[PDB]
């Protein structure tokens, strides 16, 4: 996974879904009078409306990442091993599962102060969903138009990160995928100078050799640092419809192509879907492994409203056969 | 640049064209019985149809690539350089301009060795289109459906190459470009046995540690590297659009997102276009790096036809 | 800095010291009956006995790194800006300087499980030695002849890490130094098989393939990683002169040669020592930059008075 | 193997030999009046002195590297399945063998200019000294006190390169070594300025920063960039000794120490021994693997004059 922000015409969040099969993910909008029901708190009937993408089941909207009416944005990335959900209820806090959390945050909050402020107070309870969809550890990032944060809930307890650069992978945790970043001062955008000896006359024979250093594999890690790398150094966009196509290309420079990382069970981890909401319009851009065209739906009743990705290439065919 | 072909339920070719500024390319389909000229040799009057990608200068195609109507594939690629063009004609040559190039090949030629048997005799001579397109320094992939090959002219001479991987970059020559891989033999697609020592408890936190030392930058060596990495490991499709889908992803793994690489004259090195040529169905499939939603012609008079690129995202709004 | 353990026919400790500037170090013994002064503590006037590497300043042994009579080990590394000392006494805690922690731990201490009780309840304390010797960062390896630990004092207070590999270099903190061992798995002492893929034929044309990937910088983290792999990848002497052979060309892995790696002021850091105790012989061996024949000097153990023998700063060639 | 050239306060030449077992290797001076023999030449009765490092078979120096009296060094180094061995004389140029080759040149030659003009007209000829040893691929530094020079005997002939920074390892041949010193370019002996971008604050927490991207291993291509930017940016001393002790630290760098690199034959390969030639003292200082303690010998008959290495540590026990 790679959840990523951007500031232009506009202000934007958006990820990398990265995963070895795909769950039938839709757009689901979920209005601000769909009931939430939570395990272990009591149901709220009226909140904030939200768009994002996820599955339906048993008529909850399980959300891999959204954003509400306000422009506040969450996601939830792969954090295996290291996210750690109390098995105690806590008798003076809300007690909340993983896969409640966004709805939960989205539903009250309106930006990056109000979601920190009510995730300092949570209990995030060890609780699935279903037989069917067990709980995984996740970590979160949440962004609004202006800042973002990252939330890690370890065994050492609820972990809350100023996130300067508006990027966030799987493992390690936070403070080690910005610590690793110093390592890297020395990457450049243009041709460096022959710092390595003037008694030799080193040749450039091409452009990019600014760059040399950069990580290449598919690694939480190397996504980390050539998605920060790609996004800090992204140039401006005239418009907001520039900065969307400029978002799916950051994206594009950490995707996972089919064959490249074969998991334990031998099936090959792809990016199924990458998605740019803008915040301050309140839509949602999407594409899949499948199609390259980006869709659009706008947030604008008690009834989730679910829209389907298309699994194919539409191609704009000029001519016949 | 990099070009780039796959073998999987039909068989493909295809290129990024990575530059600071379009050119205002277009799709040019050149028939039959439109006549090539050439500075110093006999035109062609009758010659296999192309269907391409390049810009139209004084009533004639100049193809950046192209396939024939045999799915032979030819691209030309910055040799910024090497490239070595001769003052001096041949008498026992083909004596022919880079610009030239694209069309003695592909009006003539239905497969590589058929290429090959022309390239062997040719005299690559340095005269310009115009004042106003000086000549660049080019090496050219040229493929079949079954096989490709590398063409080099520098000052030592005409140079091809069997291309064993279908992959193409810009410098250095192609002899290192193919050395340069050796050092990456220890990168995996799957997470590696602790080879580092038995005596520490090495752990992994995630997938993807096989890759550890691919490069990620955008230099010419790197994306050499990275594209064949990901060529060759690429899970086959089941389908010809799954394969079309596959390459597009191929290519997007050393695609120059603007802001990256900023050339001397301070201008964003980016991702052009990118394209994907059926070579058995002749058809050309492209995006462009304001449009992400793929283009389709197909090859099916004596004049050029053009179809102009769209350069404005197509989305699908629900 | 780099610190590292060798279990061998005997079991070793030793450093390279990696600075701009010498500082006039020399051999430093401390007898049994040394008078220990401590800033907050009351004096320890029979203790064990001392052999390390450091300055005398007021007829006070200073020391860089030193061993026990018993063959317990400590040596102080580089830790700036990571190292944080109290300005306050702590209550149920023995309050001692950075410049005294040696001496606390090696005057008192047989074993490293000794060393460890002794650090859980110790409060480093902000006073400096004097003024033209003020207190820097350090972190501490502490190893005897089966184990070792890692001390690092920092803001959120001493920690204690078993060290399960024998190496310490300088910043960042040991759990990065570890987490950063992960991304190299994949590297290996011998020519590995063509993963990368069988539809090219990758080509071996020399030996050390198995390595790339291995960094070769004078950082703190490539010299962590790089001693780390020659270490544990250090193959078995048959005798003891074997291992202390090998320990000098495992800190050799990581030494710094003058002009790779220029400070803030123009100078250059480099290797001004590289030492080999023999934990089990209480042996002190040494090489020095100037200097690359091996010194050996044995725990003048007896008695009131530091004994000292200067740095050889020549080259001295055996002439045939 | 790494074989080095440093200009100081005197000129110095000298290598690493790195390999899996030792040959017994020992100092052998041959005077001038020693009768070189060729097995397809003229033998040479008067020649310059030589001092070097190797074995003595059938009362033959078999040299490993070597200087002479004028101060001209060569060493020869491995080169596996690169090095070609003539199965042709040649009526025009000297049919020397590779183990000749040594002999030939620093009998003879007073500096580079002249062992250039006399490569420049050698066949090195596919001949064996005897059935226990047997030939291997080499190549050679040739260096003075002023420049240095690598032959490189191949498939397509003899090539002489100029040596614009005095290192030599193994394989790949020497334009591949140098162009691959190119992406090193950024590499830096002070801590870079944040150049990855302005808009994050990355921290400095140790010194060494620069160096960042050199690579660690004892494969040939990284022991030859880690030693030439190792070489380059080395300190000057203020004496000859300070030249000598830097040298060996240079050395250093690209030692292989016994467990970190097994060969084929699942043999520990390891720096048997290490050398600096003083040229223009004609002073030979070694050390090897077994003994830090550096030995010096002088270059000041008919006959062989031969010192075995002590292979035990050396200590000073105070
Ligand atoms: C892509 C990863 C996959 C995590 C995983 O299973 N890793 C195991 C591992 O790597 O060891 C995450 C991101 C969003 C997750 C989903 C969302 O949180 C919504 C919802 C939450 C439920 O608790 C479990 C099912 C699921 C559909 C989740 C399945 C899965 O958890 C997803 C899709
Ligand atoms: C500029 C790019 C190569 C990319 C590049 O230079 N990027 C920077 C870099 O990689 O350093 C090349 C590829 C094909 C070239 C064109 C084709 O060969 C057709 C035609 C050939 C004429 O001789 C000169 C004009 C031009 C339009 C050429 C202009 C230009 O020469 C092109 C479009
Ligand atoms: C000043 C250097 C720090 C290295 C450094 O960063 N210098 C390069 C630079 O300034 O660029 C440290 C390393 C070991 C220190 C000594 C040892 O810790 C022992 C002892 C400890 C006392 O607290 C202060 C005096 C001193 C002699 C210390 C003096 C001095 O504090 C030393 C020698
Ligand atoms: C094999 C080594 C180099 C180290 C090596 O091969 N590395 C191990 C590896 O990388 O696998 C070379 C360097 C000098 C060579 C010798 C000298 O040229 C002298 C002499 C030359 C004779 O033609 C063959 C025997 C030999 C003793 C040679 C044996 C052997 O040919 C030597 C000693």
Redesign the interface.
Known sequence: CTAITLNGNSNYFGRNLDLDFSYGEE?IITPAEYEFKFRKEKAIKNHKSLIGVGIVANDYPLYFDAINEDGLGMAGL?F???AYYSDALENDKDNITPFEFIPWILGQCSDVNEARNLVEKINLINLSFSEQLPLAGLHWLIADREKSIVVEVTKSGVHIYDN??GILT???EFN?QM?N?????????????????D?????????????????????????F??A???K????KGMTV?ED???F???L??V??????????SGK??YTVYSNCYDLDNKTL?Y?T??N??????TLNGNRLVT?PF?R??????????
Request: aromatic share 10%.
């Open positions: 757009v792969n295996p091993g290291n300067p650069i799987n493992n390690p080690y610590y970043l110093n390592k890297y001062r020395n990457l450049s955008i243009s041709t460096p100078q022959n710092t390595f000896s008694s030799v006359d080193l040749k450039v024979d091409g452009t990019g050799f600014g760059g040399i250093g950069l990580p290449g594999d598919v690694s939480p890690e190397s996504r640092v050539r920060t790398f790609s800090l150094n992204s140039s419809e969307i196509t400029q799916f290309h950051i594009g420079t995707e996972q192509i089919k064959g490249v990382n074969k998991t334990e090959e981890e851009y594409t492994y499948e390259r065209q980006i869709v659009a739906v829209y298309e194919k290439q539409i191609i704009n065919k000029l001519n016949l056969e």
